[PDB]
């Protein structure tokens, strides 16, 4: 489960939370975020 509960809208809104997380690539969800670690 590499996802984090974050309020996202569109793909780039989740790109921001993952930016500070130091990871790359991600996705979105009705009320959740998706992050992909190396």
PDB file of N, CA and C in Angstrom:
ATOM      1  N   UNK A   1       0.814  -1.247   0.000  1.00  0.00           N
ATOM      2  CA  UNK A   1       0.000   0.000   0.000  1.00  0.00           C
ATOM      3  C   UNK A   1       0.811   1.242   0.000  1.00  0.00           C
ATOM      4  N   UNK A   2       1.383   1.656  -1.147  1.00  0.00           N
ATOM      5  CA  UNK A   2       2.049   2.928  -1.094  1.00  0.00           C
ATOM      6  C   UNK A   2       1.043   3.911  -1.653  1.00  0.00           C
ATOM      7  N   UNK A   3       0.380   4.504  -0.687  1.00  0.00           N
ATOM      8  CA  UNK A   3      -0.632   5.524  -0.833  1.00  0.00           C
ATOM      9  C   UNK A   3      -0.592   6.293   0.442  1.00  0.00           C
ATOM     10  N   UNK A   4      -1.033   7.504   0.429  1.00  0.00           N
ATOM     11  CA  UNK A   4      -1.068   8.249   1.652  1.00  0.00           C
ATOM     12  C   UNK A   4      -2.377   8.997   1.688  1.00  0.00           C
ATOM     13  N   UNK A   5      -2.991   9.191   2.858  1.00  0.00           N
ATOM     14  CA  UNK A   5      -4.247   9.904   2.828  1.00  0.00           C
ATOM     15  C   UNK A   5      -3.946  11.386   2.751  1.00  0.00           C
ATOM     16  N   UNK A   6      -4.229  11.929   1.578  1.00  0.00           N
ATOM     17  CA  UNK A   6      -4.040  13.328   1.295  1.00  0.00           C
ATOM     18  C   UNK A   6      -5.199  13.811   0.428  1.00  0.00           C
ATOM     19  N   UNK A   7      -5.628  15.051   0.605  1.00  0.00           N
ATOM     20  CA  UNK A   7      -6.714  15.567  -0.212  1.00  0.00           C
ATOM     21  C   UNK A   7      -6.143  15.947  -1.572  1.00  0.00           C
ATOM     22  N   UNK A   8      -6.561  15.230  -2.616  1.00  0.00           N
ATOM     23  CA  UNK A   8      -6.053  15.492  -3.958  1.00  0.00           C
ATOM     24  C   UNK A   8      -7.174  15.729  -4.949  1.00  0.00           C
ATOM     25  N   UNK A   9      -6.802  16.428  -5.992  1.00  0.00           N
ATOM     26  CA  UNK A   9      -7.670  16.735  -7.092  1.00  0.00           C
ATOM     27  C   UNK A   9      -6.795  16.674  -8.327  1.00  0.00           C
ATOM     28  N   UNK A  10      -7.171  15.878  -9.308  1.00  0.00           N
ATOM     29  CA  UNK A  10      -6.311  15.732 -10.460  1.00  0.00           C
ATOM     30  C   UNK A  10      -4.995  15.073 -10.067  1.00  0.00           C
ATOM     31  N   UNK A  11      -4.214  14.646 -11.047  1.00  0.00           N
ATOM     32  CA  UNK A  11      -2.939  13.976 -10.784  1.00  0.00           C
ATOM     33  C   UNK A  11      -1.868  14.872 -10.124  1.00  0.00           C
ATOM     34  N   UNK A  12      -1.661  16.108 -10.607  1.00  0.00           N
ATOM     35  CA  UNK A  12      -0.626  17.011 -10.079  1.00  0.00           C
ATOM     36  C   UNK A  12      -0.807  17.444  -8.633  1.00  0.00           C
ATOM     37  N   UNK A  13      -2.043  17.467  -8.147  1.00  0.00           N
ATOM     38  CA  UNK A  13      -2.284  17.861  -6.765  1.00  0.00           C
ATOM     39  C   UNK A  13      -1.647  16.855  -5.817  1.00  0.00           C
ATOM     40  N   UNK A  14      -1.587  15.589  -6.244  1.00  0.00           N
ATOM     41  CA  UNK A  14      -0.949  14.537  -5.451  1.00  0.00           C
ATOM     42  C   UNK A  14       0.562  14.567  -5.696  1.00  0.00           C
ATOM     43  N   UNK A  15       0.969  15.115  -6.843  1.00  0.00           N
ATOM     44  CA  UNK A  15       2.389  15.256  -7.143  1.00  0.00           C
ATOM     45  C   UNK A  15       3.063  16.143  -6.088  1.00  0.00           C
ATOM     46  N   UNK A  16       2.315  17.120  -5.560  1.00  0.00           N
ATOM     47  CA  UNK A  16       2.856  18.038  -4.557  1.00  0.00           C
ATOM     48  C   UNK A  16       3.159  17.341  -3.225  1.00  0.00           C
ATOM     49  N   UNK A  17       2.188  16.624  -2.618  1.00  0.00           N
ATOM     50  CA  UNK A  17       2.444  15.912  -1.359  1.00  0.00           C
ATOM     51  C   UNK A  17       3.626  14.938  -1.492  1.00  0.00           C
ATOM     52  N   UNK A  18       3.720  14.272  -2.643  1.00  0.00           N
ATOM     53  CA  UNK A  18       4.812  13.331  -2.872  1.00  0.00           C
ATOM     54  C   UNK A  18       6.135  14.073  -3.079  1.00  0.00           C
ATOM     55  N   UNK A  19       6.060  15.329  -3.530  1.00  0.00           N
ATOM     56  CA  UNK A  19       7.263  16.134  -3.745  1.00  0.00           C
ATOM     57  C   UNK A  19       8.032  16.293  -2.440  1.00  0.00           C
ATOM     58  N   UNK A  20       7.323  16.693  -1.388  1.00  0.00           N
ATOM     59  CA  UNK A  20       7.937  16.861  -0.079  1.00  0.00           C
ATOM     60  C   UNK A  20       8.317  15.506   0.513  1.00  0.00           C
ATOM     61  N   UNK A  21       7.681  14.431   0.027  1.00  0.00           N
ATOM     62  CA  UNK A  21       7.993  13.091   0.523  1.00  0.00           C
ATOM     63  C   UNK A  21       9.303  12.539  -0.069  1.00  0.00           C
ATOM     64  N   UNK A  22       9.892  13.251  -1.034  1.00  0.00           N
ATOM     65  CA  UNK A  22      11.156  12.816  -1.618  1.00  0.00           C
ATOM     66  C   UNK A  22      11.053  11.595  -2.525  1.00  0.00           C
ATOM     67  N   UNK A  23       9.847  11.268  -2.983  1.00  0.00           N
ATOM     68  CA  UNK A  23       9.655  10.111  -3.861  1.00  0.00           C
ATOM     69  C   UNK A  23       9.331  10.550  -5.292  1.00  0.00           C
ATOM     70  N   UNK A  24       9.130   9.578  -6.187  1.00  0.00           N
ATOM     71  CA  UNK A  24       8.815   9.874  -7.587  1.00  0.00           C
ATOM     72  C   UNK A  24       7.537   9.156  -8.047  1.00  0.00           C
ATOM     73  N   UNK A  25       6.845   9.750  -9.025  1.00  0.00           N
ATOM     74  CA  UNK A  25       5.608   9.183  -9.587  1.00  0.00           C
ATOM     75  C   UNK A  25       4.525   8.963  -8.523  1.00  0.00           C
ATOM     76  N   UNK A  26       3.255   9.026  -8.957  1.00  0.00           N
ATOM     77  CA  UNK A  26       2.131   8.832  -8.043  1.00  0.00           C
ATOM     78  C   UNK A  26       0.781   8.783  -8.756  1.00  0.00           C
ATOM     79  N   UNK A  27      -0.309   8.796  -7.976  1.00  0.00           N
ATOM     80  CA  UNK A  27      -1.669   8.754  -8.531  1.00  0.00           C
ATOM     81  C   UNK A  27      -2.670   9.439  -7.583  1.00  0.00           C
ATOM     82  N   UNK A  28      -3.975   9.285  -7.850  1.00  0.00           N
ATOM     83  CA  UNK A  28      -5.005   9.915  -7.009  1.00  0.00           C
ATOM     84  C   UNK A  28      -6.131   8.940  -6.631  1.00  0.00           C
ATOM     85  N   UNK A  29      -7.051   9.421  -5.785  1.00  0.00           N
ATOM     86  CA  UNK A  29      -8.202   8.632  -5.333  1.00  0.00           C
ATOM     87  C   UNK A  29      -9.304   9.549  -4.790  1.00  0.00           C
ATOM     88  N   UNK A  30     -10.560   9.069  -4.827  1.00  0.00           N
ATOM     89  CA  UNK A  30     -11.734   9.836  -4.356  1.00  0.00           C
ATOM     90  C   UNK A  30     -11.423  10.704  -3.130  1.00  0.00           C
ATOM     91  N   UNK A  31     -10.566  10.198  -2.247  1.00  0.00           N
ATOM     92  CA  UNK A  31     -10.172  10.940  -1.049  1.00  0.00           C
ATOM     93  C   UNK A  31      -8.796  10.476  -0.530  1.00  0.00           C
ATOM     94  N   UNK A  32      -7.999   9.844  -1.404  1.00  0.00           N
ATOM     95  CA  UNK A  32      -6.673   9.327  -1.026  1.00  0.00           C
ATOM     96  C   UNK A  32      -5.610   9.606  -2.104  1.00  0.00           C
ATOM     97  N   UNK A  33      -4.330   9.528  -1.710  1.00  0.00           N
ATOM     98  CA  UNK A  33      -3.204   9.770  -2.629  1.00  0.00           C
ATOM     99  C   UNK A  33      -2.451   8.467  -2.931  1.00  0.00           C
ATOM    100  N   UNK A  34      -1.707   8.452  -4.035  1.00  0.00           N
ATOM    101  CA  UNK A  34      -0.892   7.294  -4.401  1.00  0.00           C
ATOM    102  C   UNK A  34       0.567   7.716  -4.650  1.00  0.00           C
ATOM    103  N   UNK A  35       1.521   7.116  -3.925  1.00  0.00           N
ATOM    104  CA  UNK A  35       2.943   7.438  -4.124  1.00  0.00           C
ATOM    105  C   UNK A  35       3.725   6.173  -4.502  1.00  0.00           C
ATOM    106  N   UNK A  36       4.759   6.308  -5.342  1.00  0.00           N
ATOM    107  CA  UNK A  36       5.557   5.144  -5.750  1.00  0.00           C
ATOM    108  C   UNK A  36       7.051   5.322  -5.428  1.00  0.00           C
ATOM    109  N   UNK A  37       7.571   4.621  -4.390  1.00  0.00           N
ATOM    110  CA  UNK A  37       8.986   4.708  -4.000  1.00  0.00           C
ATOM    111  C   UNK A  37       9.918   3.928  -4.940  1.00  0.00           C
ATOM    112  N   UNK A  38      11.191   4.340  -5.017  1.00  0.00           N
ATOM    113  CA  UNK A  38      12.179   3.664  -5.879  1.00  0.00           C
ATOM    114  C   UNK A  38      12.156   2.147  -5.681  1.00  0.00           C
TER     115      UNK A  38
END
